[PDB]
Amino acid sequence: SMIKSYAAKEAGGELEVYEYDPGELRPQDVEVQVDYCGICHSDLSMIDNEWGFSQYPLVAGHEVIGRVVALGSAAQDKGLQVGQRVGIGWTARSCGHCDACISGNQINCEQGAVPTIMNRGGFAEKLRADWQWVIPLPENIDIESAGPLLCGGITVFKPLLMHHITATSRVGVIGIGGLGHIAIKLLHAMGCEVTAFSSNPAKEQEVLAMGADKVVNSRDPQALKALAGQFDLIINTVNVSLDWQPYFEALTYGGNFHTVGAVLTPLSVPAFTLIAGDRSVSGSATGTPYELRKLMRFAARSKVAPTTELFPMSKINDAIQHVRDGKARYRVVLKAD
Amino acid sequence: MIKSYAAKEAGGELEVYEYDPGELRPQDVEVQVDYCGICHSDLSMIDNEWGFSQYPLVAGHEVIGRVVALGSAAQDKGLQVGQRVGIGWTARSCGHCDACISGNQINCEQGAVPTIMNRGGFAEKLRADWQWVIPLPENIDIESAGPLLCGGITVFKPLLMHHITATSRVGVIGIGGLGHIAIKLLHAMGCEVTAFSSNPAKEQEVLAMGADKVVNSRDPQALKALAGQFDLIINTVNVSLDWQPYFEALTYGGNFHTVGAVLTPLSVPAFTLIAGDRSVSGSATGTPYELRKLMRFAARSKVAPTTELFPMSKINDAIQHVRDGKARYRVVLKADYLA
Ligand SMILES: [Zn+2]
Ligand SMILES: [Zn+2]
Ligand SMILES: [Zn+2]
Ligand SMILES: [Zn+2]
C-alpha cells in the first residue's frame, strides 16, 4: 500500500506531496486514517531540524484525531476496532519492558520513547503507531477541537497530576497563548483559584473569561512581590526568559514552580530561596497513554476544548506559515480533505 | 458561490449553506471575513423574533475583513483591494432621500437595509454598498474590533447626540456587552463616569473598566441620593426597571437616553420632564461617518471590547454561549475553513 503525505524534503523546506510505502503492518502497529491533525511549534522545530535529529523526507504532525483502518497481528485484541475514533499524540512507540514502561510510565521509557514524527506523522492521509499509544476517545468528544488536547492539553494537565492539584489549590499560569489558555480552561474546570500572568493585562480581560480569577502583568515587579507566598503551583508555559525569581518567591511553603516551556536559558535557582520555603522547581512534557486516556475523558465530560481554527490539509503550507507568524488563535487544526 | 452558515427555519441551528450572490453590483464591495462578532440581534433574527426573517438566513453583522473585490462604481471610493475594513448592522441605504443626502444614511426614509437581510458575515465573504464598508485605522486590534461596529457605535452615538465632553457627568445603567464598552469610551473621553450595577461582586472589575463610581442599581436610596447630578444617563439594559430615580438623577437640561430596546413602554411623567427641562431619547446604530470616526477614536485611545473567541467552524457553540448568557462580554468568531 502507498500512503499519501505532506513531507519536507530538506530542513526548513516547504511541504510537498510525498507518497511512501509503509510496508506490512507490524504486529504491534495500528493504522489510522487522519480526520484532523493539530499543528504546534514542535512540528516546526522538526521541519526546521532545530534539534538536530530530523531525517528527510520528514512527515510531521502529531496531534491526530482519526479512525482505525487496520490492526497488526498482535493488536487485534487490544481494545480497538476498525472504524473506532482514536487519537495519536507526540509519541508512537516505547519499549514496554524497562522499569518506566512496565510501571505505566511509558513516556519515560529508558530507551527514549519514539516520536510519532520519526516513524512518519499525521500530516498525511494515514499514519501508524504502536497500539499502546493509540488513544481511545469518549463517544461524545468534539473531534474537530480534540487534536491539540493530545499535545498541548496533556502538557498542561500532567503537572496537575504530578503536584496533586485539587479545587482548593491556588495556581498561577505564566503565558496565555496556545498552552496557557488550555491550562486556564482545565484549572477552571477543576474549581481551582487561578491567576494568569501575561504581557498585556488590559488587553486581556479576555483571560478572565477563559477561567482566570485574577490577571497580573508577568514583568510588573510590585504586583509580583505582593504575591509572595501565595501559590501552591505556578506553571510556566512560555519558552522565553523572564525574571523567574519573583515567581519562586510567590510560592507558598512546599510550593512548586513547574515549567512546561522549554526555556533555552537555564533557570537561575538560588538554594536559599528553595530552602527558605521548602520550594521546588520542576518540569515535564507529554504524558503516558493512561494519562492521555484520562484527559480526553475529562475534557469531553467537562466540555473543555482548546480554541482552534481549521485549515484544509490541502493548504498545509499556508497553515504552517500561519503558525510561524504567530497568528494562531490559539491552535491550528488541519482537516483532512 | 459563497459558503455560509445559515438557519433553515426560525430558531434552527446553523448549517453550511452555499448561495449565489450573482455578479457584484456596481456599488457593492465584496469582503472576505476575518472576524465576525455575535450579538443578540443575530439571535433575534435567527429566531424570527420580529417577524421579518427570511430563510435560509445568514446572520452576522459585526465583520472585520479585507476587500477582495470592488464593484465597477466602487473603484474610486477610497477603498483598495486588500484593505482592512468593517461592516456593521447596515449594508445599504437609498442615497437620495433627505436623510441619506444629508449624511444621515442610517435614518434612510426607505429603511436602511440590514446586513443580515442582505446576507451577513456568518460566512466566508459578504457584500455591502461601498458607503457602508468602514475603513479602519492601520493600528487597530482587529480581533476585538468587530463589536465596535455595532455595540460600540450604539453607545458612542448618544455621546454625539448629546454633545458629551470631558466635563460631562455620565451614568451607565448595565455593565454587560453594551455597558462595558460605554464605560471604556466615556473614560477615554475624560468624563466623570458612574456605573449602575446589579452585581455587587463586579465592583472592582467595573472600576477597572474606567468607572469612577459604582452604584448598586438595586438600592433605591443610593439612587435617590443622586438627584440632579447627571448630565446624561445611558440605559443599556432591555429589562423594565423603575426609571423614575434615573429621571430625577438628571440635572436641569439633562438627558436620559436608552439604547436598550425595553419592551415595556417607558413611563415618563410630564411633570418630571417639565420640572427639570429634561429629555428622554433613544437610538441604535450610526452613519458611515460616525462609524469611521468611532473606529479612529477607539484605535487611538486603545478602547477595545472584552471579547471571547470561537472559530466560525464552532458557530453553533458560540451562539449557544451567547444564548446561555455567558458572553464576557462580546463573542467574536474567527473565520476558518468552511466545509
Ligand atoms: Zn521502556
Ligand atoms: Zn504538539
Ligand atoms: Zn450586533
Ligand atoms: Zn435614503
Residue numbers in the entry:
A (entry chain A): 2 to 338
B (entry chain B): 3 to 341
Sentences from the paper on this structure:
Escherichia coli possess strong alcohol dehydrogenases that could contribute to producing alcohols through a designed pathway. These powerful enzymes, including YjgB, YahK, and YqhD, show nicotinamide adenine dinucleotide phosphate (NADP)-dependent activities for a variety of aldehydes. YqhD belongs to the family III metal-dependent polyol dehydrogenases, while YjgB and YahK are classified as members of the cinnamyl alcohol dehydrogenase family. As predicted from sequence alignment, the EcYjgB structure was found to belong to a typical cinnamyl alcohol dehydrogenase (CAD) family and sinapyl alcohol dehydrogenase (SAD) family, which consists of a nucleotide binding domain (NBD, residues 165–286) and a substrate-binding domain (SBD, residues 1–164 and 287–338). We observed a cleft between the SBD (substrate-binding domain) and NBD (nucleotide-binding domain) that forms the active site with a catalytic Zn2+ ion. It was found that the catalytic Zn2+ ion is coordinated by the tetrahedral combination of Cys41, His63, Glu64, and Cys152, which were well conserved.
The E. coli YjgB (EcYjgB) was crystallized in the monoclinic space group, C2, and its crystal structure was successfully determined at 1.55 Å resolution. The NBD (nucleotide-binding domain) was shown to adopt a canonical Rossmann fold that was composed of alternating beta strands and alpha helixes, which can hold cofactor NAD(H)/NADP(H). As in other Zn-dependent CAD and SAD families, PDBePISA (Proteins, Interfaces, Structures, and Assemblies) analysis showed that this Rossmann fold can form a dimer. The structure of the dimeric interface showed that dimerization region I (residues 268–270) and II (residues 280–284) establish the dimerization interface by generating two β-sheets. In the apo structure, distances ranging from 2.0 to 2.3 Å were shown between the zinc ion and its coordinated resides; Cys41 (2.3 Å), His63 (2.0 Å), Glu64 (2.0 Å), and Cys152 (2.3 Å).
